[PDB]
Amino acid sequence: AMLNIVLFEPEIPPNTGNIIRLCANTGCQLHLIKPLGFTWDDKRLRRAGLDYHEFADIKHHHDYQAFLDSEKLDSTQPARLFALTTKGTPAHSAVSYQANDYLLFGPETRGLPAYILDALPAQQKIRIPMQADSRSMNLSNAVSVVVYEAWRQLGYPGALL
Amino acid sequence: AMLNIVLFEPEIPPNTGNIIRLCANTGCQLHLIKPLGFTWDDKRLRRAGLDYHEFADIKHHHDYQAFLDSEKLDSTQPARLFALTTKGTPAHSAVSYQANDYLLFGPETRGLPAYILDALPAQQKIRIPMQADSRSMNLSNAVSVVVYEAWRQLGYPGALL
């Protein structure tokens, strides 16, 4: 894959719909780690405005370990997996992205759990810069920012020129 | 202002709510050019999860010319106004942004009208790169991408470090 976008237990349906469209438009592979916070239904997805090809090839994983095992990533410390957390060290734009990187995002109302984050090196925990005393960014907006920054760094391979 | 985000006739309420949060978190000034496609109500905005300070200082303009006149921009060719259009020339990241730039976005179901776009030089019409045969990006995701790219170029002034 060019980039792998990984949603851990996403909760709010329109964020995931928007992220499906994002991934389709940019050539990224989407991964969804269950449980989802909303019902998953091809008819709802079609009703939302998505075409079959935009969702058909999403990789679905029954838990985090299943994702790691599917992608042959080390559980002690997965390589080239960057987790979005307001408690991260480097800005999302301060990392140097590579093809096939994994971009991990937590649920809207919780973020990623400590068992995940505490296993990752500081430089694999990325933060989207915000002013002092900010509030929660919309998840699909956050994912879009990180994806487009990564894709920019890669020179937008696959973009129509 | 650090950056000015200008929505022309926005249509879908959650996109504007998300963009309000975006602008609050990044220190941008939001401008809304009427008519909006949804009812504007402080109580709905509060219900959506926004605090008063996030929306109180939005600049509201009754039409495009009123926006131009408010901001002392030339109508024949406004300076440092970049309009998002799939028909633009430079990628959004190929422009060099400056403090107080204006970032103009059209409605979700229409984009910007030709009377606006045809007045702007090619290098002021920016495009978000997408793969061949893509579909419409969510407006709040698009605005987030452009805002964060601009803010990155500026060195994230005002961000908590």
From Swiss-Prot, chains A, B:
Reactions accelerated catalytically: cytidine(34) in tRNA + S-adenosyl-L-methionine = 2'-O-methylcytidine(34) in tRNA + S-adenosyl-L-homocysteine + H(+); 5-carboxymethylaminomethyluridine(34) in tRNA(Leu) + S-adenosyl-L-methionine = 5-carboxymethylaminomethyl-2'-O-methyluridine(34) in tRNA(Leu) + S-adenosyl-L-homocysteine + H(+)
Binding site for S-adenosyl-L-methionine: 84, 106, 128, 136
Entry GO MF terms: RNA binding; tRNA (5-carboxymethylaminomethyluridine(34)-2'-O)-methyltransferase activity; tRNA (cytidine(34)-2'-O)-methyltransferase activity
Subcellular location: Cytoplasm
Keyword hit for Cytoplasm: yes
This protein's record includes keyword Membrane: no
Cellular component, GO annotation: cytoplasm
GO process annotations (BP): wobble position cytosine ribose methylation; wobble position uridine ribose methylation
Key words, A-Z: Cytoplasm, Methyltransferase, S-adenosyl-L-methionine, Transferase, tRNA processing
Family annotation (Pfam families): SpoU_methylase
The enzyme's E.C. designation: 2.1.1.207
Family membership: Belongs to the class IV-like SAM-binding methyltransferase superfamily. RNA methyltransferase TrmH family. TrmL subfamily.
Protein purpose: Methylates the ribose at the nucleotide 34 wobble position in the two leucyl isoacceptors tRNA(Leu)(CmAA) and tRNA(Leu)(cmnm5UmAA). Catalyzes the methyl transfer from S-adenosyl-L-methionine to the 2'-OH of the wobble nucleotide.
NCBIfam families on file: PRK10358.1, tRNA_yibK_trmL
Complex formation: Homodimer.
HAMAP family: tRNA_methyltr_TrmL (MF_01885)
Identification of the protein by name: tRNA (cytidine(34)-2'-O)-methyltransferase
Source organism per UniProt: Yersinia pestis
